[PDB]
Design a protein around this ligand. Structure first.
Ligand SMILES: COc1ccc(C(=O)NCC(N)=O)cc1
Ligand SMILES: COc1ccc(C(=O)NCC(N)=O)cc1
Ligand SMILES: [Cl-]
Length: 163
């Protein structure tokens, strides 16, 4: 584990992370996709061998020795608010289990069920709170990667608020 487990946020490409493993904002089918998923495919294409996994789950595939944890958040276009919220919480709980199993001291993580899986709603607070609920009991350093200036500030404030 990290000596003093922390949360940090950066606004940059998660494919250029400085952590011991990465979480992909994957689709259920292991397709290259667009956005974060496509950046992850371009950087670690070998990690998309049998990466397909259902909504609300996480499936780790090695690229060399670098673990890619494919986490499938619900697409709120398709899910009800109630069912989508349940599946989004579940995906993050599966990420925490994989991060623990891998024995890593750090993980790069994007906010799941945002952007094209958001159903046209700002889900920063909903997604980040489910991330915290799952990761708080882990001792990995967590580095959250985002792609929005207003989000970077809010995530940073939310981290600093808990101390
Ligand atoms: C390729 O990774 C990234 C990483 C971050 C961004 C981003 O912050 N866009 C919004 C802005 N430029 O205000 C875009 C792409
Ligand atoms: C009002 O609807 C939305 C819908 C989606 C977003 C969103 O996820 N932004 C961050 C990103 N990285 O794409 C923000 C607002
Ligand atoms: Cl997404």
């Amino acid at each position: 584990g990290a000596m003093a487990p922390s949360y940090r946020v950066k606004r940059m490409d998660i494919a250029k992370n400085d952590e011991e493993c990465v979480v992909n904002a994957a689709n259920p089918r292991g397709l290259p996709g667009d956005g974060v998923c496509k950046a992850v495919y371009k950087k670690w294409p070998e990690s998309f061998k049998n990466s397909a996994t259902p909504v609300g789950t996480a499936k780790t595939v090695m690229c060399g020795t670098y673990p890619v944890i494919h986490a499938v958040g619900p697409n709120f276009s398709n899910y009800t608010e109630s069912e989508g919220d349940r599946e989004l919480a579940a995906a993050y709980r599966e990420v925490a289990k994989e991060v623990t199993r891998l024995g890593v001291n750090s993980v790069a993580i994007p906010l799941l069920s945002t952007g094209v899986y958001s159903g046209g709603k700002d889900r920063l607070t909903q997604s980040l709170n489910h991330l915290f609920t799952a990761m708080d009991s882990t001792d990995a350093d967590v580095v959250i990667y985002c792609r929005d200036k207003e989000w970077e500030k809010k995530i940073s404030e939310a981290i600093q608020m808990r101390t």
